[PDB]
């Protein structure tokens, strides 16, 4: 007996057929578009989408006024809207079955740092977050895959402690400036 | 019968092992001879053999 929990989950699925050209090319498309480190981030987002689709299908097998359908559909729709993947005017479960991996890829912190003009590229965005220059609200966030909510979209900025931000010069610049 | 047969074979193996391990370094056998080799020049061998 120990005061430990052993509850833990794999968060991705390896595909059944390893070598098919269309899936490889589409994965490479997404990796290049979004600056992902490897195929496993594609598999991770694909997994969360598959989970959400299974939940929506099992809710849709229920009859229309079933209270579990109303409660759990409202919760699922509210969460998908809250991370900005579904529009607010599309609170219908069937629209969940229309989504794509690219939406949850657009809601990453890497992509939102790229689209807000703090970075010159998507790879510059991953590097910018990973090196403690990006802060959401007033919290330094180091994780590229941090999914940004709609109330947190207008609050992504530069760390008040970063050289590009508040302004203490970095290690290289302070080394070079003291040579002369 | 399976339990008894396994016990018989285990007794055979353990008595053979006990005889062989008893031979080395005991009263009826030759001393256990040990070679100490220091594999660096920073190792103070007289400290270890003390």
């Amino acid at each position: 007996p120990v005061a430990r929990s052993w509850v833990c989950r794999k968060t991705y699925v390896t595909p059944r057929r390893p070598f098919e050209k269309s899936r490889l090319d589409q994965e490479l498309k997404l990796i290049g578009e979004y600056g992902l480190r490897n195929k496993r981030e594609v598999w991770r987002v694909k997994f969360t989408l598959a989970k959400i689709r299974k939940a929506a299908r099992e809710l849709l097998t229920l009859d229309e006024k079933d209270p579990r359908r109303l409660f759990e559909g409202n919760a699922l729709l509210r969460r998908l809207v809250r991370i900005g993947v579904l529009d607010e005017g599309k609170m219908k479960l069937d629209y969940i079955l229309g989504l794509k991996i690219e939406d949850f890829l657009e809601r990453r912190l890497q992509t939102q740092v790229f689209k807000l003009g703090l970075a010159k590229s998507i790879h510059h965005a991953r590097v910018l977050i990973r090196q403690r220059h990006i802060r959401v609200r007033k919290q330094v966030v180091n994780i590229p895959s941090f999914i940004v909510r709609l109330d947190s979209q207008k609050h992504i900025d530069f760390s008040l402690r970063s050289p590009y931000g508040g302004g203490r010069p970095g290690r290289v610049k302070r080394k070079n400036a003291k040579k002369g | 019968d399976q339990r008894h047969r396994a016990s018989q074979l285990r007794k055979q193996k353990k008595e053979a092992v006990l005889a062989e391990k008893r031979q080395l370094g005991g009263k009826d056998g030759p001393p256990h001879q040990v070679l100490v080799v220091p594999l660096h020049s920073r190792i103070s061998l007289p400290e270890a053999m003390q």
């Binding site: 007996p1 120990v2 005061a3 430990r4 929990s5 209270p67 109303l70 409660f71 409202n74 | -």
Partner: protein, 262 residues
């Protein structure tokens, strides 16, 4: 085992205690006492995990050993003493009084009461019997025996009893049209009015209760505690008045409170 077990694992503790998984291997393990193990709140869980007067069990012992804690008017120094339904906890250093009555979700409320309401308690009578020299005795739900009860008091009635003297002050019979709180099963904590009692000989009777909104639910007769006469309760009730809201209405009231306050 070769004799009584003395330990309680945390994951085997009662769920309504609300203990978390990773604090320890063990749960506080109530002592033997006036309430069952699965239906009690030990004093350490109340005074640490609910009221947060103490942060560890050691200073729960420090609060107890100063004789600042009373259950039903008596100084209880044991930190795992089993307190249960309708118990009146008095802390006169802070000048606070509590009654251990259930939530609508089946957990022991932190329910603050008036010092005037701390004087009495309601006990469900559990057996009546005649002892030597023809003396009527009454055994309640928290192991009290009262000599010479009123002859009108039968089993399953509720007695209002005075904590200082230990003598019966009043009683309520088990009738229809009469107010009860559920003390077990899936409907635990709900408060309503008795409407029916379908008797099953050699088996368990089932009592039908109607909520203040019109919701109807049944329980076993052992799960019924009469708490008022007719429609008005004889004690203070907690915030939720025994009306179990559905999860949709819980979500709606939570969002309405967020929108109004914030």
């Amino acid at each position: 085992a070769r004799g009584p077990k003395k330990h309680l694992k945390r994951v085997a503790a009662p769920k309504h205690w609300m203990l978390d998984k990773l604090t320890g291997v063990f749960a506080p393990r109530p002592s033997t006492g006036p309430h069952k193990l699965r239906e009690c709140l030990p004093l350490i869980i109340f005074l640490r995990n609910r009221l947060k007067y103490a942060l560890t069990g050691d200073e729960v012992k420090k609060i107890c050993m100063q004789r600042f804690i009373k259950i039903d008017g008596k100084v209880r120094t044991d930190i795992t003493y089993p307190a249960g339904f309708m118990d009146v906890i008095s802390i006169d250093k802070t000048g606070e009084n509590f009654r251990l009555i259930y939530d609508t979700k089946g957990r022991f409320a932190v329910h603050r009461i008036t010092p005037e309401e701390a004087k009495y308690k309601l006990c469900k009578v559990r057996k009546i019997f005649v002892g030597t020299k023809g003396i009527p005795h009454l055994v309640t739900h928290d192991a009290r025996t009262i000599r010479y009860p009123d002859p009108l008091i039968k089993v399953n009635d509720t007695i209002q009893i005075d904590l200082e003297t230990g003598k019966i002050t009043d009683f309520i019979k088990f009738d229809t049209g009469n107010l009860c709180m559920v003390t077990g099963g899936a409907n635990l904590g709900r408060i309503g009015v008795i409407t029916n009692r379908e008797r099953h000989p050699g088996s368990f009777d089932v009592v039908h209760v109607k909520d203040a909104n019109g919701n109807s639910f049944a329980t076993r007769l052992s799960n019924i505690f009469v708490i008022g006469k007719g429609n008005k309760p004889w004690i203070s009730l907690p915030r939720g008045k025994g009306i179990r809201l559905t999860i949709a209405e819980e979500r709606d009231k939570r969002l309405a409170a967020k929108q109004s306050s914030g």
